[PDB]
């Protein structure tokens, strides 16, 4: 550590507090982490899932019982680009390539067997290129939480979920771009489900084969019907809404996959523009 200089806080991350730190060796400017031997070796192995849409992990440092994390450095992340175009909205050009992006780095990491399992906007970053990179990737196997992105099957008990997880979660993501307010706001684990449902419809064993003997699954959780996208996702266009009504599947085996999402007609005219950034 005492090749770091710390110059900014960013914040408190899920693992550790996340600092702008300079390295005193080469001068190159990084993201800092300050987070047993099973992390160390999965740690070490997301050190090779090297991707342009993924944050790159640049060293895992152990000393004195505690773990360091140094990753390449982004100037904003999403949630800000977003609170500063709240009043104009993001043009739908940047929300697909942005989509477009992530979908190119979540094929990347699930064709390597890695997943994020907790996208969110505090962990994707942007540069002034327009490029879009998801962070803290695969942290989660190695070791208040937002519940806004949470695939149904980790909220009813799935303990052996798959790479759908990060679909469902880039998902709600893209409704969030579009309407400009979360999809699924919720503020406890069954506020979080019972949101899901008043909008998706309460899942049964017709759209989601076997979810009735999830382990949280509950036959007292109410009837709610389902509602249009028109409704849900307003003005977005209708390749927009059947993208996104394939990346929001209750069953994750009907869930699309990254790989086949960047294959969708929503992407025909896909651009890379570059964003109005002030740092
Ligand atoms: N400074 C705050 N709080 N918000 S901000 O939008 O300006 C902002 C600025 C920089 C960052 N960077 C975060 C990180 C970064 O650069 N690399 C990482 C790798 C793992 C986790 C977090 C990061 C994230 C947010
Ligand atoms: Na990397």
Same mark, same amino acid.
């Given at each position: 550590? &005492?090749?770091?200089?710390?110059?900014?806080?960013?914040?408190?991350?899920?693992?550790?507090?996340?600092?702008?730190?300079?390295?005193?060796?080469?001068? &190159?400017?990084?993201? %800092?982490?300050?987070?047993?031997?099973?992390?160390?070796?999965?740690?070490?192995? %997301?050190?090779?899932?090297?991707?342009?849409?993924?944050?790159?992990?640049? =060293?895992?440092?152990?000393?004195?019982?505690?773990?360091?994390?140094?990753?390449?450095?982004?100037?904003? +992340?999403?949630?800000? @680009?977003?609170?500063?175009?709240? %009043?104009?909205?993001?043009?739908?050009?940047?929300?697909?390539?942005?989509? @477009? /992006?992530?979908? /190119?780095?979540?094929?990347?990491?699930?064709?390597?067997?890695?997943?994020? $399992?907790? %996208?969110?906007? /505090?962990?994707?970053?942007?540069?002034?290129?327009?490029?879009?990179?998801?962070?803290? @990737?695969?942290?989660? $196997?190695?070791?208040?939480?937002?519940?806004?992105?949470?695939?149904?099957?980790?909220?009813?008990?799935?303990?052996?979920?798959?790479?759908?997880?990060?679909?469902?979660?880039?998902?709600?993501?893209?409704?969030?771009?579009?309407?400009?307010?979360?999809?699924?706001?919720?503020?406890?684990?069954? +506020? /979080?489900?019972? #949101?899901?449902?008043?909008?998706?419809?309460?899942? +049964?064993?017709?759209?989601?084969?076997?979810?009735?003997?999830?382990? +949280?699954?509950?036959?007292?959780?109410?009837?709610?019907?389902?509602? =249009?996208?028109?409704?849900?996702?307003?003005?977005?266009? &209708?390749?927009?809404?059947?993208?996104?009504?394939?990346?929001?599947?209750?069953?994750?085996?009907? #869930?699309?996959?990254?790989?086949?999402?960047?294959?969708?007609? @929503?992407?025909?005219?896909?651009?890379?523009?570059?964003?109005?950034?002030?740092?």
């Amino acid at each position: 550590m &005492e090749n770091f200089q710390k110059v900014e806080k960013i914040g408190e991350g899920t693992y550790g507090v996340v600092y702008k730190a300079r390295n005193k060796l080469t001068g &190159e400017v990084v993201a %800092l982490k300050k987070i047993p031997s099973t992390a160390i070796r999965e740690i070490s192995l %997301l050190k090779e899932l090297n991707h342009p849409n993924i944050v790159k992990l640049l =060293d895992v440092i152990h000393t004195e019982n505690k773990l360091y994390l140094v990753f390449e450095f982004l100037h904003q +992340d999403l949630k800000k @680009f977003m609170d500063a175009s709240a %009043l104009t909205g993001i043009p739908l050009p940047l929300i697909k390539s942005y989509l @477009f /992006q992530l979908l /190119q780095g979540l094929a990347f990491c699930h064709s390597h067997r890695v997943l994020h $399992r907790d %996208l969110k906007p /505090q962990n994707l970053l942007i540069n002034t290129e327009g490029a879009i990179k998801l962070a803290d @990737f695969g942290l989660a $196997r190695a070791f208040v939480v937002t519940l806004w992105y949470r695939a149904p099957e980790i909220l009813l008990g799935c303990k052996y979920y798959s790479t759908a997880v990060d679909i469902w979660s880039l998902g709600c993501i893209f409704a969030e771009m579009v309407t400009r307010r979360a999809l699924f706001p919720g503020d406890s684990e069954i +506020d /979080q489900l019972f #949101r899901i449902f008043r909008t998706l419809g309460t899942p +049964d064993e017709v759209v989601w084969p076997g979810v009735t003997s999830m382990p +949280d699954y509950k036959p007292s959780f109410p009837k709610w019907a389902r509602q =249009d996208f028109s409704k849900v996702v307003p003005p977005l266009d &209708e390749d927009g809404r059947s993208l996104l009504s394939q990346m929001l599947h209750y069953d994750p085996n009907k #869930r699309i996959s990254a790989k086949a999402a960047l294959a969708h007609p @929503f992407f025909q005219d896909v651009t890379k523009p570059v964003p109005h950034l002030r740092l």
